[PDB]
Every structure is written in structure tokens, then in C-alpha cells.
Amino acid sequence: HPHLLAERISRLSSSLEKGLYERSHAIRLCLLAALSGESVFLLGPPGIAKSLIARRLKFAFQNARAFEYLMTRFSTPEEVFGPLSERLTSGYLPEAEIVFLDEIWKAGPAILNTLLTAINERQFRNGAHVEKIPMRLLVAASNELPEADSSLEALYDRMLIRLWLDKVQDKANFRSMLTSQQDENDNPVPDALQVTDEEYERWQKEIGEITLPDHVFELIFMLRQQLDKLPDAPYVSDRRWKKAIRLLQASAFFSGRSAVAPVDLILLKDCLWYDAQSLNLIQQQIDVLMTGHAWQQQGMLTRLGAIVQRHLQLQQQQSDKTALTVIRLGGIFSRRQQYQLPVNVTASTLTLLLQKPLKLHDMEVVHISFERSALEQWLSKGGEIRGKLNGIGFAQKLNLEVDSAQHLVVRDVSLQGSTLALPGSLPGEIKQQLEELESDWRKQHALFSEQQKCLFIPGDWLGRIEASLQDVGAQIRQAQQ
Amino acid sequence: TLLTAINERQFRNGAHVEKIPMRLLVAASNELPEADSSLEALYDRMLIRLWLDKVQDKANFRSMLTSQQDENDNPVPDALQVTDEEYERWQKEIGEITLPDHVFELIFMLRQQLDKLPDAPYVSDRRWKKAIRLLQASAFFSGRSAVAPVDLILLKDCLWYDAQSLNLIQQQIDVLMTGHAWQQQG
Amino acid sequence: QNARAFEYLMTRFSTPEEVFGPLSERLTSGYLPEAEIVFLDEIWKAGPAILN
């Protein structure tokens, strides 16, 4: 039964897209928020299809009403909620479902005061006795941004989705859009894809029953502590974290899932920023989190380093068997030039082992890696060499010289010698621990290859997730060679 | 109330709503609205922006100064007046006009040219969609079945918004019509 | 057992007639003179007559 729900939603959003190209992210987000009792906000220049989406989502139901009003600087509350006689609310907002409010950043003082009580309580102060408001979707569009110290920020902090629409840019999607024969006032939604009033009241209760996995909570709490340490990061209130869960739980509900999926965190890119300055900061932190700690991308990186450290620890103990012989070629030159091994080594960032460890830069080291593009220059022209320690940090300078027996003596602050050596051409203990970590990559990749059919996920985000999973898998297959 | 009578051709009336048989919406004024006001919502929705001015020619002013033609009679004959049935049928055949591939190369090029110029006015996506209905209607009443490249001349009064951008829109189209239209500069 | 709520937001252009109730003598049906627990957010921007 839950698997058949994702098919009906995919056919409902397909009929709503017919007529508005390059607006999939602006229509799918409004349909999910309407079925879960959430709001949505739009921003952009007037004329990028902002009022039609408010009149298009009403055809997906069976008892919805439209209300397209423009808030002016001299607007009165009696002209919005209907004039009083006790208030004639015949087709306005208290009895409507999907209302539209354009230029909301300039209404009267009493207009904004009545809108705050109709969101947290879904009621209205209609004279003496109050009544409920069957509001299913709240949308608002404008153009500019409010002040930093004003009363208009009370409503902006309560809206969940902050859509960022813009004009068309693609040429192929503009051909049929320029000459579109589809009417904007008909009923393109079939009668079989429209939900009833009974199914809406039942879905409002099953969303809260979605369980929260322990691995999902590790990503939400980490993002909150990350934005608090950055001064340029925008502040996120506690209400935004609670209202965002209802959106993620509703995305997995209409997609054939019973728990919160880690891929649902992509929708948080339009629920944290507030201006154009913080727009590039929210999309940057989530892109790193979705390609770092989502499917355990960086989690396997800190575990693979312990396997390499354990493998290199057993190779430096038996380094006396295979040393490092440098070829001789001192012909006619002012300095005894050297050269590395030919076909034996071909890597660029190869590592070199040492016998007796030394204390370089007030720390211990067990392996030093050099660059192939930088080793040929020092062994031919001379000068100084720069190499990092333990494969981390920057390429610090070392006191490396040539040996009489064709070796590499590393000098420190105590004038101590250390002959370098290269690792030869896998122990059973390292192979056993490596297969356990490699099997974890296939388990995390199998989860992404099953839930990628979510309709509420953009298409440009799948290119960065797949490129992040292949980068980790390409590094774990190099040490096993 | 004027915004709901354009996109939906309806008007609220207490309880039930009704349609408006509005065929032509004309508006005239003198000054320009503010840059940050609610009056810009109606200006961005109007298609044709006619720029009328006083007479300048001397030959056309002689008969105009002493004109005996009445302005309250019926100079239109009864044989040239269309009926209510022909109006409802013409509203459907306008959308059936095909869009040639050579015409699309000029509309998309004009949109990208105004975006690179900082002094050029901004044109929303609604204006590009509503302008096609005007060009397709010009070729419909002229004996054509497709969008004619010469119909782009009427775009000189559907892009500008003030007196500053009036000389910029009429200059870019004049070069486009005498450059990339019939492959002049091409 | 007989309390009433009143969530109001004070603005820089608020009027006293929109808080206590518009006059006809003042229609104070469910506001502040007959309420018990009222809420006032952003009180540091109200008008001079509201604070008085």
C-alpha cells in the first residue's frame, strides 16, 4: 500500500507542470507543503510565474478556493477578510484554502497582526465567537527585501520554504514556452488524481508517526553547531528546526518510505537563508555535508587512514630487507646529480619509509611522501627540497642530502642519520580489516541506488552525490594494489 | 479588483461570480508612477504602451484645425461591423499560428541583448508570452498563416517603461530590423 | 477556567484603536480590558499614545 502512494503523487505533479517550464522546484515544493500544512515563500521580479502557482494547486483537490489579493500601503483589514455588517466572509480567507498575497512587505499594521493568529492556531477573531480556517497552503510573493529592524521579520521567520525563482535562461525550454497553447484557467488535472477531504485529514496525522533514525539526528545536530560557529552564517531559530522535520517526514511519506531518509536533507537549502548574501552560504555548507557525512563519505576516510597507518607500521619494521638504491650518473656537472628508479616507480605522490625514526618539527614520523614533479628538479638543479610529514600538513623543508652508498640520509636538529627506503610489492591482518571497510561502501551505495527516485529531489544534486561516492571508492582500491 | 478582471475575466459579486465581456482595455494619463509602489503591478501587465504626442506637420494641421467631422456619429458602415459569433471564433484561431524557426532566432537574440546592457530595461517572461498573441493576430488579419518577421516592428511600444528607455528600445529594434531580420548585417 | 488570549504585535505605525478596540463606547470584545493574559511582542517600537 505505501509503495503505490509514490506512483499517484508522481502523476499528480506531472499534470501541474504542464504549462510552466523550468518551474519543477517551484511547484513540487508547494504540493508537498499543501498536503502537510506548511507555507511557502517566493521572491523575484514580477513576471516569473508567481501568481499562477497559487491558482494551479487548487485544481489538484476537490474543494479548494482561490484568493489573489495585492497588499498596498493603504490597504485596510476590512477589504481582505470581508466587510462587517458578523463579518461577511463570503469567499475570502477564513473559509478559503489556498490564498495568494502579493507584495506582503507593505500592508497595514492590523493586517499583519491578524495573519499571525491564523497560522499557529488556524483560527480568526471573527467578532465574538472564533472559527477555524481550513487553510491548506499559504503562498506569498514580492520583489524586494524588508528592513533589518522592522515588524515584517515576524512573518518571514515563520515561513518554511523560501523559493528562489528567476527568469528563464535555457533556449530549448523557451521555444514551447514562448508559444504555449495551454490555457491557464482550465482543469488539466484529471478527476482520478484529485484527493478527497477524508484523505487529507488522515494524512495530517500519519506524517507525525514517521520515526527518526539515530543516524539522521547526527546530521541535523551537526549542521546547527556548524552555523553557530561561523559569524557570517545566518541565525536559525528553534521553530525552523521543528517545522523542517514536518517537511522531510512528508517527503519520505509520499515516496514509499516509513522513516526519515538522509537524502531528504537537500530541501533544507531553501529553508535557512534570508537574503542574497546568505544564499551562497547555506547551499555551500549542505553540499559539503551531503558529500561528507551523509552516506559516510568522510566517515570512511578517517577509518581508512588507520588501516594505512597500521599497514605502513608493519612495512617499516622489515625495511632492512629492501633498501633504496639510487642510480649513479655523475658525469660532467658542478654537482653530483641523482635520479629516481625508472619503471619500478611511476606514481607522482609516492611515499618513502625510514628505519630509525627521528623527531622532525617536534613530532614523530613513520613515513615521508615526496612529489615526483619536485624530486627531479632538486636532484638535477639543486637547492632545497620540500616535503610533508605523515602525508598531512604542508610541504615543510627537510635536511635531506646524498649518501656515499647511494641512499637518502635525512638529517634533523641533532645531526642524526636515517636511510630512506621504498615499500616493496598485503598481510592477512590488513586484508581482513580492509574488506570490512570496503563492504561498508557497498552498503551505503546500495541505499542511494534505491531511494533516488524521489520526485521531491532536484536533478542537479545527483551529480555531486555520485561523484562523491566514486571518489572514496577510488581511494580504497589503491592501497589493495 | 482590476487585476482579477484581466487574467480571469471575472469579477466578484458578493456570492457567485460572473464573467466580463471585456474586449478592449485602454488607459491614459500624463505622469509616471513611483519606482517602489503598488501601481507597478498593472503597468507590467499591460502590453501595448502607446506614445502619443502633439502634431508637428503643417500640411496635416490645416484640415485638422478646421474639421467639420462629428465625433459622436457613426462613421463605420453596418457591413464592416463584426458580429458576436465571429469574435468568439477568432479568439481560438490566433493560438493556432505556427512559429517558424527563423522567427525564434530574433526573439531569443533580442532578449539576450537587453540583458547585457545595464541601461536597458528589464522585460519579464509574461511580456514575451503576451507579445506573441499580438504578432500572431497581426498576421491573422493580413492573409498569413505563420508569424511574419516584419511583425517585430510593433515591439517598439511593448518593452520600454519611461522616457529614458524610450530611445533605447527604438534604437535596438531599428538595428535588429535592419541587421538580423532579412539578413541585412548577416 | 475563564482566561482569554490576546497575541498582538506592536509596530512603528500602530494605533491605540487597533489594540483595545475601535470606538463606535469602545467595542472591546475580546482584547485587553476584558482579557486576562495578553501578549505584546516587539513593545519597543509602539506609538506614544499606546505606552501612555
Ligand SMILES: Nc1ncnc2c1ncn2[C@@H]1O[C@H](COP(=O)(O)OP(=O)(O)O)[C@@H](O)[C@H]1O
Ligand atoms: N517562466 C514562465 N514560464 C511559463 N509561463 C510563464 C512564466 N512566467 C509567466 N508565465 C505566464 O504568465 C502568466 C501570468 O503570470 P503572472 O501571474 O503575472 O506571474 P507573476 O505572478 O510572477 O507576475 C501565467 O499564466 C503564466 O503562464
